Amino acid sequence: AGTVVLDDVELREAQRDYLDFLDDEEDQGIYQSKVRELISDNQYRLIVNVNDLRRKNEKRANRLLNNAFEELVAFQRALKDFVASIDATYAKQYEEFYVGLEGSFGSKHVSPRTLTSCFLSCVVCVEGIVTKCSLVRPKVVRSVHYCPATKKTIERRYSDLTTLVAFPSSSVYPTKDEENNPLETEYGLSVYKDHQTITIQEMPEKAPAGQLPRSVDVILDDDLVDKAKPGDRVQVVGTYRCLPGKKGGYTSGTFRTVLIACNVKQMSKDAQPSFSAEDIAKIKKFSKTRSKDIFDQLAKSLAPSIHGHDYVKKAILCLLLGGVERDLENGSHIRGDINILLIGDPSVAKSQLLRYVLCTAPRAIPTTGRGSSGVGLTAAVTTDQETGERRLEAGAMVLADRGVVCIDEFDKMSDMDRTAIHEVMEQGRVTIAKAGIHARLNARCSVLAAANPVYGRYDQYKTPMENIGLQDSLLSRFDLLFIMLDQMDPEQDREISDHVLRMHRYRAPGEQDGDAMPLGSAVDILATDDPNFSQIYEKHDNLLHGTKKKKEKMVSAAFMKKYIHVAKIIKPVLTQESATYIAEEYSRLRSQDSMSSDTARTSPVTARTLETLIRLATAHAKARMSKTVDLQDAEEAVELVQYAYFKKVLE
Amino acid sequence: AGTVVLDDVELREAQRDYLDFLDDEEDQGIYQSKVRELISDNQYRLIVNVNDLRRKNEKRANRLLNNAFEELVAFQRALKDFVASIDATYAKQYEEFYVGLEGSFGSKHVSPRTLTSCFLSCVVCVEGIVTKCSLVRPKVVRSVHYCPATKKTIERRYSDLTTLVAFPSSSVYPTKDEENNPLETEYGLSVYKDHQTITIQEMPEKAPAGQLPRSVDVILDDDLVDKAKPGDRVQVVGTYRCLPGKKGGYTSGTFRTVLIACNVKQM
Amino acid sequence: LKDYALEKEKVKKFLQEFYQDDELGKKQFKYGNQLVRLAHREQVALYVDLDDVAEDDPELVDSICENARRYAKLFADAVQELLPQYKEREVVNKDVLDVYIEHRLMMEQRSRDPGMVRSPQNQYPAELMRRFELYFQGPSSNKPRVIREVRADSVGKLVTVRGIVTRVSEVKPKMVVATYTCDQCGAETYQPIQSPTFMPLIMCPSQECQTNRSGGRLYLQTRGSRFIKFQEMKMQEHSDQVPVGNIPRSITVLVEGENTRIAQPGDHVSVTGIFLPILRTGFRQVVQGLLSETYLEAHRIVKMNKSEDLTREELRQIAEEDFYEKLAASIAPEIYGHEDVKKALLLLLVGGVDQSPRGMKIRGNINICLMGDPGVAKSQLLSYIDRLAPRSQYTTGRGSSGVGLTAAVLRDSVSGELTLEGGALVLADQGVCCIDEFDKMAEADRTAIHEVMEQQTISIAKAGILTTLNARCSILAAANPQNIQLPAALLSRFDLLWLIQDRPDRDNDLRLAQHITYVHQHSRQPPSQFEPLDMKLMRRYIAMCREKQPMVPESLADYITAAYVEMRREAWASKYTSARTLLAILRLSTALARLRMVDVVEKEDVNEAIRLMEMSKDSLL
Amino acid sequence: SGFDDPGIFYSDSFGGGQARKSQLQRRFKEFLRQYRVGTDRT
Amino acid sequence: CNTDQAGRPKCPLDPYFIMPDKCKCVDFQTLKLQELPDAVPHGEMPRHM
Amino acid sequence: CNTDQAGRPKCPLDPYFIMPDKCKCVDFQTLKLQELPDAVPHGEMPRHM
DNA sequence: AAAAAAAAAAAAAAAAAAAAAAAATTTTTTTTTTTTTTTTTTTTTTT
DNA sequence: AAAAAAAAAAAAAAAAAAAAAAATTTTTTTTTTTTTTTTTTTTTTTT
Numbered sequence A: 001a002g003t004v005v006l007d008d009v010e011l012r013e014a015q016r017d018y019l020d021f022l023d024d025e026e027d028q029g030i031y032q033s034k035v036r037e038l039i040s041d042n043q044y045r046l047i048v049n050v051n052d053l054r055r056k057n058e059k060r061a062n063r064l065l066n067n068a069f070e071e072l073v074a075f076q077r078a079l080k081d082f083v084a085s086i087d088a089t090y091a092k093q094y095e096e097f098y099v100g101l102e103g104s105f106g107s108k109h110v111s112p113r114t115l116t117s118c119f120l121s122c123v124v125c126v127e128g129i130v131t132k133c134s135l136v137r138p139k140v141v142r143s144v145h146y147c148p149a150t151k152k153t154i155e156r157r158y159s160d161l162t163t164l165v166a167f168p169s170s171s172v173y174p175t176k177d178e179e180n181n182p183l184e185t186e187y188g189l190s191v192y193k194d195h196q197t198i199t200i201q202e203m204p205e206k207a208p209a210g211q212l213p214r215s216v217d218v219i220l221d222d223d224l225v226d227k228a229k230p231g232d233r234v235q236v237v238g239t240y241r242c243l244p245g246k247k248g249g250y251t252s253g254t255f256r257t258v259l260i261a262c263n264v265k266q267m268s269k270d271a272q273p274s275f276s277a278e279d280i281a282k283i284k285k286f287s288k289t290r291s292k293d294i295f296d297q298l299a300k301s302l303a304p305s306i307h308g309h310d311y312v313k314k315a316i317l318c319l320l321l322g323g324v325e326r327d328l329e330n331g332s333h334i335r336g337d338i339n340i341l342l343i344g345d346p347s348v349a350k351s352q353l354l355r356y357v358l359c360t361a362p363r364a365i366p367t368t369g370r371g372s373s374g375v376g377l378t379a380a381v382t383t384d385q386e387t388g389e390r391r392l393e394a395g396a397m398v399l400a401d402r403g404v405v406c407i408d409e410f411d412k413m414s415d416m417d418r419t420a421i422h423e424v425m426e427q428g429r430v431t432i433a434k435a436g437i438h439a440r441l442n443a444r445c446s447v448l449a450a451a452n453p454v455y456g457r458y459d460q461y462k463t464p465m466e467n468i469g470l471q472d473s474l475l476s477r478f479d480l481l482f483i484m485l486d487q488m489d490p491e492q493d494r495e496i497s498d499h500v501l502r503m504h505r506y507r508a509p510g511e512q513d514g515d516a517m518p519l520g521s522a523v524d525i526l527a528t529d530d531p532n533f534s535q536i537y538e539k540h541d542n543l544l545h546g547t548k549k550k551k552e553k554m555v556s557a558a559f560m561k562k563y564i565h566v567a568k569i570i571k572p573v574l575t576q577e578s579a580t581y582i583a584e585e586y587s588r589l590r591s592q593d594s595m596s597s598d599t600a601r602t603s604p605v606t607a608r609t610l611e612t613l614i615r616l617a618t619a620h621a622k623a624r625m626s627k628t629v630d631l632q633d634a635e636e637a638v639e640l641v642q643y644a645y646f647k648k649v650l651e
Numbered sequence B: 001a002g003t004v005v006l007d008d009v010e011l012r013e014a015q016r017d018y019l020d021f022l023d024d025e026e027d028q029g030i031y032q033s034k035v036r037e038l039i040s041d042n043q044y045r046l047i048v049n050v051n052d053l054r055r056k057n058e059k060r061a062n063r064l065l066n067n068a069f070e071e072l073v074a075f076q077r078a079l080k081d082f083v084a085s086i087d088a089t090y091a092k093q094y095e096e097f098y099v100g101l102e103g104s105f106g107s108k109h110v111s112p113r114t115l116t117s118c119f120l121s122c123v124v125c126v127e128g129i130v131t132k133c134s135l136v137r138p139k140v141v142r143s144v145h146y147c148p149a150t151k152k153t154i155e156r157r158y159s160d161l162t163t164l165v166a167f168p169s170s171s172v173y174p175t176k177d178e179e180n181n182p183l184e185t186e187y188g189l190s191v192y193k194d195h196q197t198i199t200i201q202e203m204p205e206k207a208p209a210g211q212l213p214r215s216v217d218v219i220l221d222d223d224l225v226d227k228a229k230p231g232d233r234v235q236v237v238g239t240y241r242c243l244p245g246k247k248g249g250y251t252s253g254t255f256r257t258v259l260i261a262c263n264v265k266q267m
Numbered sequence C: 001l002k003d004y005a006l007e008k009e010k011v012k013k014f015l016q017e018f019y020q021d022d023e024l025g026k027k028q029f030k031y032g033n034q035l036v037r038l039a040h041r042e043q044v045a046l047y048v049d050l051d052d053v054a055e056d057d058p059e060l061v062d063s064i065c066e067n068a069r070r071y072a073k074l075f076a077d078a079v080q081e082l083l084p085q086y087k088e089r090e091v092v093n094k095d096v097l098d099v100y101i102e103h104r105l106m107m108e109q110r111s112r113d114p115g116m117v118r119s120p121q122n123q124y125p126a127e128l129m130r131r132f133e134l135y136f137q138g139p140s141s142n143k144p145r146v147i148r149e150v151r152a153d154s155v156g157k158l159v160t161v162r163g164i165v166t167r168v169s170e171v172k173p174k175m176v177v178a179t180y181t182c183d184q185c186g187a188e189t190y191q192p193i194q195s196p197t198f199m200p201l202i203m204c205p206s207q208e209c210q211t212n213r214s215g216g217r218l219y220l221q222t223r224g225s226r227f228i229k230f231q232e233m234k235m236q237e238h239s240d241q242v243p244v245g246n247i248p249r250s251i252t253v254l255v256e257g258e259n260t261r262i263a264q265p266g267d268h269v270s271v272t273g274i275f276l277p278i279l280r281t282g283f284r285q286v287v288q289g290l291l292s293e294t295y296l297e298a299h300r301i302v303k304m305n306k307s308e309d310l311t312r313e314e315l316r317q318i319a320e321e322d323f324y325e326k327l328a329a330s331i332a333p334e335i336y337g338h339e340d341v342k343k344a345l346l347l348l349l350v351g352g353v354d355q356s357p358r359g360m361k362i363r364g365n366i367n368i369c370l371m372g373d374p375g376v377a378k379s380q381l382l383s384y385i386d387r388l389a390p391r392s393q394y395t396t397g398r399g400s401s402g403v404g405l406t407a408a409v410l411r412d413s414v415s416g417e418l419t420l421e422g423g424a425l426v427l428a429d430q431g432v433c434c435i436d437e438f439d440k441m442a443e444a445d446r447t448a449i450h451e452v453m454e455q456q457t458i459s460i461a462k463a464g465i466l467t468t469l470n471a472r473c474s475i476l477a478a479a480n481p482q483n484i485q486l487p488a489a490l491l492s493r494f495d496l497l498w499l500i501q502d503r504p505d506r507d508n509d510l511r512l513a514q515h516i517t518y519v520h521q522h523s524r525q526p527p528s529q530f531e532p533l534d535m536k537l538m539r540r541y542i543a544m545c546r547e548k549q550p551m552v553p554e555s556l557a558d559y560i561t562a563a564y565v566e567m568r569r570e571a572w573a574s575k576y577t578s579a580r581t582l583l584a585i586l587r588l589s590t591a592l593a594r595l596r597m598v599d600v601v602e603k604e605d606v607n608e609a610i611r612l613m614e615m616s617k618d619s620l621l
Numbered sequence D: 001s002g003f004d005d006p007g008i009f010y011s012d013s014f015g016g017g018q019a020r021k022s023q024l025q026r027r028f029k030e031f032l033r034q035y036r037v038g039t040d041r042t
Numbered sequence E, F: 001c002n003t004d005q006a007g008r009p010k011c012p013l014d015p016y017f018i019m020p021d022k023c024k025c026v027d028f029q030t031l032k033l034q035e036l037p038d039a040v041p042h043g044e045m046p047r048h049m
Numbered sequence G: 001a002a003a004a005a006a007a008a009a010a011a012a013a014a015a016a017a018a019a020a021a022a023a024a025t026t027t028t029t030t031t032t033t034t035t036t037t038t039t040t041t042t043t044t045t046t047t
Numbered sequence H: 001a002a003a004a005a006a007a008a009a010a011a012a013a014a015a016a017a018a019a020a021a022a023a024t025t026t027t028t029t030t031t032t033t034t035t036t037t038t039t040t041t042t043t044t045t046t047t
């Protein structure tokens, strides 16, 4: 055999401390519950909060952070022992239970640039964007061979010597028996582990301006291989180590470094929100007690900082809630995504509304008229340059799939790009193809666009068709088109100015002392935890300088986010009464005689107008948590479309 | 970890047959009684009659007498399993149990003059007169080491490769830790087995008068070391094998043959 | 562990004593008859159905699904052992490899010496003398997996996936057993190839040369060797099964033997096979370990869900005179109205008869261009036709442009050569190419489409490519607006240019709104007198029509000429018509006759063709 | 597919002044088989 | 191999493998420096270090 | 070790140890033949072989 | 709105910096064993 | 019974064969990374 340790004092102490920490039963069983949850979910990787670990035993936390491999092995042994104690069969099912880390890393939290050799063999939490990924390959961790000549069955094991001294003996795949009998490998019986290599680059918006970006190579293994794709703003918690070179004889002293990832995370904004019992109870209470005016309350509480534009705010809320897709048995599809175009006079806060949607709605992609040009906007087809094979790169729409694309300077956008996105706006999919590849990417995103009317400022004395240079083909697929006019009414100016000045004079309680400048400079960002991958919530915003007073509260941002997320899943069904009402209203709307004279249509009326009527009714039902599209929902939809589709020509 | 064996048909059959042969309650009970006797006497070697083994199972007898090493390994595994079944607490005391043979060996009963190449790896019974009897030296089979710097304790295991190919890594005695700390060997915790080498000569009366004597070298491991002294007439039963030479890019066909005694009995 | 001799006996027992009533209710030895066939060398591929196996031995099915390669070899060896006792006569030596096998067996018998024991390596390899191949058909209880989810945890298992075929190499000979002949003795040497590469042998290990201690240099040659039809394809996930924001994932499928030439790029396929690795040595492995590729070895390829490769009920349905209208109304039942448009689309899906009079082809394809205002369901119609037609490529404005419509050149991997990969038009070579936003499509793309319409080919004379492609597709363009935009370029080419103007109207708009709202209520069109045909039935009927070439009797010659002359006079008097319009008449009438499933076109077909043409023409006004 | 390695199989030497060593071995074999001692009488 | 052999077969010819875990590594950067444009003679390509 | 193709990392120089138990051994003996005393010439020594 | 010019990109070809792979018996030493010689010790023969 | 001569025993020194031990970096390849270039294609400007 060989050397076998008997009394490793450090290993015994580490195992004891980690098992004590994982007991947690007296410590409100946080990690007991986590272990039980992973057992039920059939997972074999425990994510541990380093902050809790440090609180329990700062010594163990420091030892783990500064000595990665040894302490991680001890932690995994303790986790396997705990899993066996809770349930032995599962522990025997899974050979090794891995431990990934999470929380606030004081100094270990770095970027690919600040990640220097001082962090070798330490636990580092590096932020960045995945520049490239590799195919998921299986590495044999235990091979099984059968010898026909002797009917024997052997099993060879290969250890994970990724960042350890490896010799030819350990990495030789048997191909003969001791008597030179050919073997045959039993692939089914053999054990493989999935392995992938990615590249994390410093975020361009974080990198020093004008310099080339700093990268790092990351190794992912079983249960972490496909946690990211190129262009993902990922946080990788791992162990930084030097990769061994090939058996040489002369060494230059240069060692490639790599990050053995122990955990991968995406932007927490798109993550599944945590709904506690009290939170769901509050949502139930809100929906039940207030249903008649809940949609109006949410619409008015949507963007507190932007005054007026009540109809536009309601339309934006409908866009956020979305409709419901129709998946017909014969494959025909109907989008449930509302498209909104805000056009009007300069300085009407349309860009502010788009920015608010970007900040709030999950999977919201900003874009500018000329910022994205075709292949950048939709998907693109390139070549690997190393394999000679075609490859697909997701554009803004694809990345915004099941989300929102907030486009600004839509008018400035070239006609080619608008023609290209025509398909996305209605079918919600991108159809690209080159000679060696063809795909139909899913882009189920709602387009919220902003534009400036021709002549810079809206012309009250010209038809909306002439004011808007967008042709009918592109106008139709916009479900709602709102003309936001900078009317010069003295009273509206009074209200707007009062709101703006109040918002400017507001200061955040506690953090601001009356003279602080909150800007930081490229260091505090890494010093403190990133508020982009981080881990009690009220319902109505407490009175503050934002508003003076009234008998109508304003919904909290977090509560509104949770409520919208819950309500978006609802798929209210269209009732016969609402269906008949919508059909008759669509007939009347299409019949031009209904609308008065001196009134010009913003956009043409079409079957798509009917479809957006249905979608708006569905969105109102979702807001109400109704589960059925009712007469009030149909009324609100018809009201909104009637307001949006007609504008009075002044003279 | 390396190439372990998952299932082995021949080894499983051999161990099952030997365990069946050793388990005697539906039969007379001779060998169950013998195992109980050795348990009572605190020994770790059982003398199994080749005649009884041939009577109960001809195939196992032929296999044991023609390919002794692995067959004796299987027999000793079965013996340890049976001793554990009778009483596990005693079976835990001794790492391994040994199977000596006795009885009648048809063509495997030879003199040192008749012990030729044909009997290599077979079980043979040789009766002769002891000429040389070396000292009983301890041979370390498991060495315990202590690192004063790191307070660690280590165990190094050396396989009994007397007749198997041995590589230096197997026999490297450790002296320094991973980071070159000094290691002190703990003699009180290491494990050593008595080892001796003797020579068995063709009996002067039975040898041909005209010609010079013929002798054979015999290795006696623990429990068989001080059983014989020079001038004694003894019967040694064991495996006749070839001893590996030493590492070298050149070799003559010559090999040094010995007899690893599995039992020694007085004339 | 398991005893593979016992497993071989189990598979022999199953293969011999499994029976089914498939043959017209009569009990049959499903696999026994196949064994007889391929022992006579009348069949090559033996597809063992794991549902059949599980019918009596579920544990064997589980073991196969866990170690499919091992049991694949067990089944193949069992078949090979059973063949001699099922042979009932002498084969006719249909193949040179059969000649080689006959000679090898005869010479082995001649030098048998039955009692003698020959060395384990002094024998013909199994693969060298098979002439058959055993594949599986995955058990129906195994839910198909997603290419993304097929990972290292299921290597060596038997799994089935479904997806779109993107890239498919050609069929080329892959060495399976390399045969060498010595220059001293006169024996043969056999190297069974398993790795992607092999190092040819140099010295002959035959007994005669070993005894002679002579040179014994052996010569690799293809004559006595054993090749197998080989192909390598890329299979792409389906759009509906891709995650939210990701792109579809690809898998490599290695097809061998008789599974070749089944799938072609653009096909929707389901492939069942074993997930196996390829050793990845040769590179400067950055990370230590035995890393390997991954691939699916094709055991069962089945085109499904768009291009799947009769009954008294369907015969009666065809015999019904309103079958034409039934199919038309079934085309996109959700879309309200557009009855004549849907009838034209059905005529497109059917197509006319191809003509080859004295060295020039008058193609029978039908070209239709849907001009219309926004929101008149042109895109929906084109998407539905794409889902319905067998070989359909739906190309939007510019995502698939240039080489997205025409072929390009890409480096290969099996040969490292430059292979010509087809574009959308070639992928729809003999089907339907639904072009959307044809007006906004690029100029080069529009010229390519014009050329394919006029010739069914695509000539290219660029730098890296110089070829004359073949794209015999029918163009279904959907442009938007001489009204306001009615190019003579489109008029002169499209056989049916339809204008779809939606003037507001209380009654029609209300009916359409009720249709739409019921559709959104029940995920289906409002119930009608006639239930619309399922896509499978529509495809079956259309395919049966396609092979029903009706001819034009000389009696209708004067009728057609009179109609054409009358249309010419009307067009001349009014404020476009030509021989292209006449050929449109001819092929529309032929397609209507084909729809009726007769051999001779009739005045009713001619009248319907003229009626549709006049509806299209006066849609302009 | 690049993991296993079967041996190299071979067949018999069908077909085909110094005499080859195989020929001389065949002649030795025939000498052993077909050396006759005695007489028809005995 | 330095190890004081105990009479066993000696270790192989090239027995040493780097232990990347047991190494002390430091940052190291390579820069390109160019002759200042003013310092360059009139007709002369800049020097590099 | 000619079987280095099973893995890129290479085996040492002079790597082979003879396995004793896998040896087909035979009996061999050495004898000292001396010329016949009646063959040795009168004044001479007995030759050996 | 169409044609021409500009550039922008994609892909393919080419040339170094670093790392990785390939190739490799002969001379001398020592240990054991065996034999020869010297002296001491023991044995045997003669007085 | 003792002394003298013979022979044996014990012990030490020397020689021959055979198994063991010691010594043993340079040169070439080649892969990856970077840059260069030719053509196709796309965008912008002008009439």
Ligand SMILES: Nc1ncnc2c1ncn2[C@@H]1O[C@H](COP(=O)(O)OP(=O)(O)O)[C@@H](O)[C@H]1O
Pocket (backbone or CB within 6 Å): A305, A306, A307, A308, A345, A346, A347, A348, A349, A350, A351, A352, A353, A450, A496, A499, A500
């Ligand atoms: N109704 C309003 N209430 C509050 N602020 C407004 C309003 N309209 C315009 N603004 C202010 O105008 C500024 C810029 O408007 P912007 O979002 O750029 O609109 P646009 O995109 O039309 O230029 C914002 O800081 C915003 O506060």
Ligand SMILES: Nc1ncnc2c1ncn2[C@@H]1O[C@H](COP(=O)(O)OP(=O)(O)O)[C@@H](O)[C@H]1O
Pocket (backbone or CB within 6 Å): A334, A335, A426, A607, A608, A611, C334, C335, C336, C337, C338, C372, C373, C374, C375, C376, C377, C378, C379, C380, C381, C478, C516
């Ligand atoms: N005649 C119709 N019947 C049913 N639905 C229609 C009809 N016309 C338009 N629609 C609906 O209006 C939407 C827009 O149709 P689309 O296919 O984009 O028209 P276009 O081809 O003119 O762009 C689709 O969701 C479709 O379901």
Ligand SMILES: [Mg+2]
Pocket (backbone or CB within 6 Å): A350, A351, A408, A450
């Ligand atoms: Mg703006």
Ligand SMILES: [Mg+2]
Pocket (backbone or CB within 6 Å): C378, C379, C436, C437, C478
């Ligand atoms: Mg369209």
Ligand SMILES: [Zn+2]
Pocket (backbone or CB within 6 Å): C182, C183, C184, C185, C186, C187, C204, C205, C206, C208, C209, C216
């Ligand atoms: Zn030969």
